[PDB]
Each structure stands twice: as C-alpha cells, then as structure tokens.
Motif scaffolding. Sequence first.
Motif, PDB file in Angstrom:
ATOM      1  N   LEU A  48      13.119  11.263  -1.192  1.00  0.00           N
ATOM      2  CA  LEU A  48      13.772  12.313  -1.966  1.00  0.00           C
ATOM      3  C   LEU A  48      12.864  13.530  -2.097  1.00  0.00           C
ATOM      4  N   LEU A  49      11.576  13.301  -2.375  1.00  0.00           N
ATOM      5  CA  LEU A  49      10.619  14.404  -2.449  1.00  0.00           C
ATOM      6  C   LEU A  49      10.582  15.190  -1.144  1.00  0.00           C
ATOM      7  N   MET A  50      10.398  14.485  -0.024  1.00  0.00           N
ATOM      8  CA  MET A  50      10.243  15.168   1.258  1.00  0.00           C
ATOM      9  C   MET A  50      11.521  15.894   1.660  1.00  0.00           C
ATOM     10  N   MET A  51      12.682  15.297   1.383  1.00  0.00           N
ATOM     11  CA  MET A  51      13.935  15.970   1.708  1.00  0.00           C
ATOM     12  C   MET A  51      14.138  17.203   0.836  1.00  0.00           C
ATOM     13  N   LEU A  52      13.717  17.140  -0.431  1.00  0.00           N
ATOM     14  CA  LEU A  52      13.776  18.325  -1.278  1.00  0.00           C
ATOM     15  C   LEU A  52      12.899  19.439  -0.725  1.00  0.00           C
TER      16      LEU A  52
ATOM     17  N   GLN B  62      16.849  22.222  -8.858  1.00  0.00           N
ATOM     18  CA  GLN B  62      17.121  21.582 -10.140  1.00  0.00           C
ATOM     19  C   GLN B  62      17.149  20.059 -10.025  1.00  0.00           C
ATOM     20  N   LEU B  63      17.585  19.526  -8.875  1.00  0.00           N
ATOM     21  CA  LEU B  63      17.503  18.087  -8.616  1.00  0.00           C
ATOM     22  C   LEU B  63      16.077  17.577  -8.767  1.00  0.00           C
TER      23      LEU B  63
ATOM     24  N   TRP C 114      11.687   0.901  -3.402  1.00  0.00           N
ATOM     25  CA  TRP C 114      11.788   1.958  -4.412  1.00  0.00           C
ATOM     26  C   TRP C 114      10.971   3.199  -4.055  1.00  0.00           C
ATOM     27  N   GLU C 115       9.642   3.056  -4.011  1.00  0.00           N
ATOM     28  CA  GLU C 115       8.786   4.219  -3.802  1.00  0.00           C
ATOM     29  C   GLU C 115       9.070   4.895  -2.467  1.00  0.00           C
TER      30      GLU C 115
ATOM     31  N   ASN D 179      11.671  13.809 -10.302  1.00  0.00           N
ATOM     32  CA  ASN D 179      10.311  13.619 -10.792  1.00  0.00           C
ATOM     33  C   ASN D 179      10.287  12.802 -12.079  1.00  0.00           C
ATOM     34  N   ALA D 180      11.217  13.080 -12.998  1.00  0.00           N
ATOM     35  CA  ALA D 180      11.265  12.328 -14.247  1.00  0.00           C
ATOM     36  C   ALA D 180      11.609  10.868 -13.994  1.00  0.00           C
TER      37      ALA D 180
END
Lengths: 106, 106, 106
Positions: A10-14, A93-94, A3-4, A99-100
């Motif tokens: 996702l964070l790093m790709m954003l 916006q993703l 999961w993490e 984050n939520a």
Amino acid sequence: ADWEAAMLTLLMMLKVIEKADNAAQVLTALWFMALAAHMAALATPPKLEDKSPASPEMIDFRVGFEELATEIGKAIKLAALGKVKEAQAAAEQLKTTVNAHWQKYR
Amino acid sequence: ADWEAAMLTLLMMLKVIEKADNAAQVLTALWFMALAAHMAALATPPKLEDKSPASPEMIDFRVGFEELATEIGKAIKLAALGKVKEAQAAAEQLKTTVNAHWQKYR
Amino acid sequence: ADWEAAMLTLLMMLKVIEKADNAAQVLTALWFMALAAHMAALATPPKLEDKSPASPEMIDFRVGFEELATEIGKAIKLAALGKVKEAQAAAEQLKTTVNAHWQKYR
Ligand SMILES: [Zn+2]
C-alpha cells in the motif's frame, strides 16, 4: 499474502500514485491497493497471532482494512472517470488511514 | 473497492483486451477483470443500499458477478495457453454480461 | 477465475520472477500470484466437480491454496524490503508447492 507485505505494498503503490501521470497508471495502482487491502483483511497481524478470531482486537484489525478499501474504491472511481488530480488527492488522504492502521499493529 | 469503480474497470480492461497484441497483455488485463468482479461481488450497488442482505435483489446482484467471473476464467485459461484470438473473442462476448449487469444496477 | 487458469498464471508469474530485474517487477508478479491463488481457493478443480463441499478432498484442495498463499506472502515481504535475490529464491521454492498442487488435481 501476509500483513506487513500488504502494508508495504500500500505504501509503495501510494508513492507510485504520487508520481503517476495518466489515469491508467493511477487506476492499476489503486487496484493493487485494493487487492493488498483485501489480502490483509484475510491475514493475521503481528500484534495478535493467538487472540480469539472473535476478540475485539482481531475483528477491529479487519474492519480497519474494510474501511481502507472503501476509500480506495472512492479513489478508483475518481481515476476511472479520468479525474486524475482528484484521485491523487484521494490517495494522499488514503495515506493517513494506511499509516494509522500500520503503526497500530506493528 | 466499490461497485461502479469495478464496472468501469471491467469496461476499460475489455477495451485494453480489444487492443492487445501478446498473450501477457490479454492475461494480466483478464486478471484485473477477475479482481474487479470479485471486489464488486463483495460490494453494495447503487440500486439497493438498504435492502436485506438476504433480499433476492441483493443476492442476485452477486450471483451476477459470480457468473461474470466464470466467463472471465474461461478467457484467462484461453489466454494462458497462448490462444490470443480465442481469448479476445471470449472477452468481446464478456462485454454483453458486463453491460447487462451494469444497466441492471445503475 | 477458474482452476487451471490460476495454476497456469502461477507458473507464468514464477517464470517472470525468474527473469525479473528490479524489486517492482518481482513484487507485482508476486501480487498476481497471490490473486491467482486466492481465486483458485474460491474455485472448483477438475478432480472433484461433484464431491461434497465438506468432502476431505474438496477442503484439502483449498487448504493447499491457503498454504501456497502463505509462502507467496513471505516472498512478497522479501520483495518489498528490496531483497530481490531473497525473493527470487523464495519463488523458486514456491515452484515446488505450485507443481505438487497442480499434478495432484490435474
Ligand atoms: Zn476474496
């Protein structure tokens, strides 16, 4: 995957999308994001290791990642047509969904 | 991911394979293709948003992407063994399945 | 994708991780590994083309790839937090599972 790892990916790709230049750099990153969201949809999070697979927390955790992957697909289609700035706005916006979804299951 | 994003990604990766040099460039592109075909197999296309999940159009749309992923796997195995020209020929033949699957659901 | 393509891809990505420098190079390779393990989990191997889908050989072949993907997720989480040497050690240990899963179904 777990999961993490998917959430951090996702964070790093954003961030990479935040600092990308051409449509290919945005598009492959968005595909890494879709892959991570899919894997996390197949994962078991920290907040519910021993719930029921049919427990509302459990399946809501996964509808959340289906939801995230839908917006990712929007951004991918934007990036493929060359709409780079549009895809980067879709990604910033993703971030909110990412984050939520993250804090809800830390 | 969604549908047309996956289709456009298959197109662009086929072009990258058309202009690739070493086996790694072909292999990672073919893996992006497999990922996009998988995602599209999990997607709902434009021509049948409200059909039945058991409607023959619906499940034929997905057997089509399983079919595409099989040829992708052939090309991947060729690329991994270093057979670069063989894998590029397998990909230029993949184009037919990609395009026919595309127009059938535009 | 098919089976031996995924196995060869896991091998090559493990080698890339063996010769990687920064956390991004390790992380994207580990994500290619997760993708290949997932695809192989959806694949049918050489040693059991016509067994039963509920035959113990068949489903053990797939629990093997679920098992592999778990260790991959460990390594991914290590790489995302910047623990590069830790992730490379996790990958050199991944090699054992990869190779044992390989020869068991050649
Ligand atoms: Zn899947």
